[PDB]
Amino acid sequence: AKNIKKGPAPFYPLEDGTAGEQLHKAMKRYALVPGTIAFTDAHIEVNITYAEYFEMSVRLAEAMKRYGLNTNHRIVVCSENSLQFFMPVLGALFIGVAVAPANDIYNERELLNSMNISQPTVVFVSKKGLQKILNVQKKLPIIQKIIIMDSKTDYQGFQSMYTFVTSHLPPGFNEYDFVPESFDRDKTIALIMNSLPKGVALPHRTACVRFSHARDPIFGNQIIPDTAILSVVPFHHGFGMFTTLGYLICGFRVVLMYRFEEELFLRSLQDYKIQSALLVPTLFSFFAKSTLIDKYDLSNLHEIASGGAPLSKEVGEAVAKRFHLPGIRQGYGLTETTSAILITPEGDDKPGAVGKVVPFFEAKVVDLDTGKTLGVNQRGELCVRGPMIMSGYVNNPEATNALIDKDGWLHSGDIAYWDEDEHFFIVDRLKSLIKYKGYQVAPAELESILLDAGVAGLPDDDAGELPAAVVVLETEKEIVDYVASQVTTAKKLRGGVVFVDEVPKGLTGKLDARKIREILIK
Numbered sequence: 087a088k089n090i091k092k093g094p095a096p097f098y099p100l101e102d103g104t105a106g107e108q109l110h111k112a113m114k115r116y117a118l119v120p121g122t123i124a125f126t127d128a129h130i131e132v133n134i135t136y137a138e139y140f141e142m143s144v145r146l147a148e149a150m151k152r153y154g155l156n157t158n159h160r161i162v163v164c165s166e167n168s169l170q171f172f173m174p175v176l177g178a179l180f181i182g183v184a185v186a187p188a189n190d191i192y193n194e195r196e197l198l199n200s201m202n203i204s205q206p207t208v209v210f211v212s213k214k215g216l217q218k219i220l221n222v223q224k225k226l227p228i229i230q231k232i233i234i235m236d237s238k239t240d241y242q243g244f245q246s247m248y249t250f251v252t253s254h255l256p257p258g259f260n261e262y263d264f265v266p267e268s269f270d271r272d273k274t275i276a277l278i279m280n281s282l283p284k285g286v287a288l289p290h291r292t293a294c295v296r297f298s299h300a301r302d303p304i305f306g307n308q309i310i311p312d313t314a315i316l317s318v319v320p321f322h323h324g325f326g327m328f329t330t331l332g333y334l335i336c337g338f339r340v341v342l343m344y345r346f347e348e349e350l351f352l353r354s355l356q357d358y359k360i361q362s363a364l365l366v367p368t369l370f371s372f373f374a375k376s377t378l379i380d381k382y383d384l385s386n387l388h389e390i391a392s393g394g395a396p397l398s399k400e401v402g403e404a405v406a407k408r409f410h411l412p413g414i415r416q417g418y419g420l421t422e423t424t425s426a427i428l429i430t431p432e433g434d435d436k437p438g439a440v441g442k443v444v445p446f447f448e449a450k451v452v453d454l455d456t457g458k459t460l461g462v463n464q465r466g467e468l469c470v471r472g473p474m475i476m477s478g479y480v481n482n483p484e485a486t487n488a489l490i491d492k493d494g495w496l497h498s499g500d501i502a503y504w505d506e507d508e509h510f511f512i513v514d515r516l517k518s519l520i521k522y523k524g525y526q527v528a529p530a531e532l533e534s535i536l537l538d539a540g541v542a543g544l545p546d547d548d549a550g551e552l553p554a555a556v557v558v559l560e561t562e563k564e565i566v567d568y569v570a571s572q573v574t575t576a577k578k579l580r581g582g583v584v585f586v587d588e589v590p591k592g593l594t595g596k597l598d599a600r601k602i603r604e605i606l607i608k
């Protein structure tokens with residue numbers, strides 16, 4: 087088949103060594119370049135240079151190494167976005183310790199599940215998540231040491247990263263003579279991300295491939311001095327984990343925000359002369375008729391990238407017009423494929439599309455019932471294969487086999503198609519789709535008519551399901567008759583409106599057709 091969309095050759099080549107070796111290199115170079123900033127906290131106007139950041143990470147790597155951390159070990163990083171977030175991350179990659187990010191805002195049972203799977207020996211937590219760790223550490227004797235990420239001194243009894251380094255580093259330790267560990271790239275896990283979620287094991291190799299897309303001037307961002315990115319996405323999530331690590335490879339300035347504010351964001355875009363802004367589709371609400379935008383100097387802004395959830399083509403084009411960009415750059419990925427494997431290639435837009443198959447990958451679309459590869463414009467389940475695909479779910483080989491087949495194809499459970507130009511469009515998640523009779527109804531299409539809103543299906547005994555909605559006012563039958571008179575016959579709101587304070591969305595933009603399913607049933 088040429089019914090398989092393949093990715094082109096990389097405009098930037100894969101590189102040798104492990105991911106920590108590749109990163110130690112990049113960052114040591116920048117450390118030696120005075121004044122280059124790794125991270126900026128827009129909330130407290132604080133910078134931390136590549137010189138400082140490299141020194142503390144190397145310092146903390148060696149300190150973990152002397153503590154007895156190695157390839158048999160996992161550590162968890164449990165934190166809101168911060169200047170301190172990537173210190174333990176980087177530190178461990180340099181010496182081959184597995185890093186398991188734990189969701190900042192997980193409840194206790196979710197946080198217990200996560201760590202139960204990841205089995206951490208040392209836990210890194212912000213001050214904000216400490217009591218959550220303590221409350222569940224009871225059930226997890228694997229944890230022997232707890233360290234506070236964002237404190238200089240000890241904190242309520244626990245060593246901080248700084249005081250920990252002090253006890254385990256020899257004085258007059260030179261950070262520029264530290265050499266990271268070499269080991270098997272495909273065999274040594276770098277990260278364990280969560281999806282009840284499962285631990286996604288990602289070998290060093292998958293981050294090394296990512297480091298090719300990151301520097302690829304067509305699929306990523308060409309290394310160019312004094313480049314500043316403004317990232318809003320969470321670091322414990324694949325979206326933020328692998329975009330950010332790619333930025334440090336490029337030596338970019340990552341201006342982070344621990345919570346989106348309308349004014350702060352627009353402030354920092356101008357102030358920090360920012361070239362690229364990393365958002366999630368939910369934050370496009372605020373830039374509908376955002377009056378503010380017109381005040382600022384957003385002349386430096388070259389692009390705005392979205393991911394992690396669908397962006398309506400309408401609001402995508404609107405927002406882009408407001409920033410005078412050609413359009414919204416876009417990337418599609420799953421936790422299980424490391425980072426984005428569909429990316430809007432520079433110099434090749436297509437509204438609605440999530441992009442084209444990145445280098446090293448192949449994407450295809452299959453029949454739900456027979457698995458046959460489907461052709462152009464034919465909708466079926468999206469399948470991808472390439473070297474960023476996880477090695478497995480940690481300690482759950484069954485679920486690894488249910489997802490990745492013999493030939494290496496990952497089954498995304500997203501319905502999607504490609505066109506004559508090999509651009510890929512994502513309809514919806516398969517389980518998010520409504521089956522009114524035999525006829526299929528896609529939430530995304532109904533919601534753009536309404537626009538807040540969320541569309542799911544009432545399990546009608548008659549039709550199977552009936553296209554329903556939740557509505558956040560800016561009445562009902564004055565809308566169902568508006569719905570029915572916008573769509574066609576099977577897409578009429580055969581399940582009505584149920585007004586709500588707020589539409590159930592996950593931290594990266596996705597809705598919740600399971601919670602919304604339950605919610606409408608009242």
Ligand SMILES: Nc1ncnc2c1ncn2[C@@H]1O[C@H](COS(=O)(=O)NC(=O)c2csc(-c3nc4ccc(O)cc4s3)n2)[C@@H](O)[C@H]1O
Binds near residue numbers: 281324416440500
């Ligand atoms: N761009 C998109 N458009 C529409 N839907 C999207 C989507 N991305 C994820 N999704 C949906 O969320 C699911 C994925 O959720 S997930 O498991 O938590 N993982 C992710 O969402 C995930 C893991 S890595 C990553 C991204 N990396 C990027 C790098 C550069 C860039 O410009 C944009 C992006 S997005 N996203 C998908 O299965 C799909 O349903």
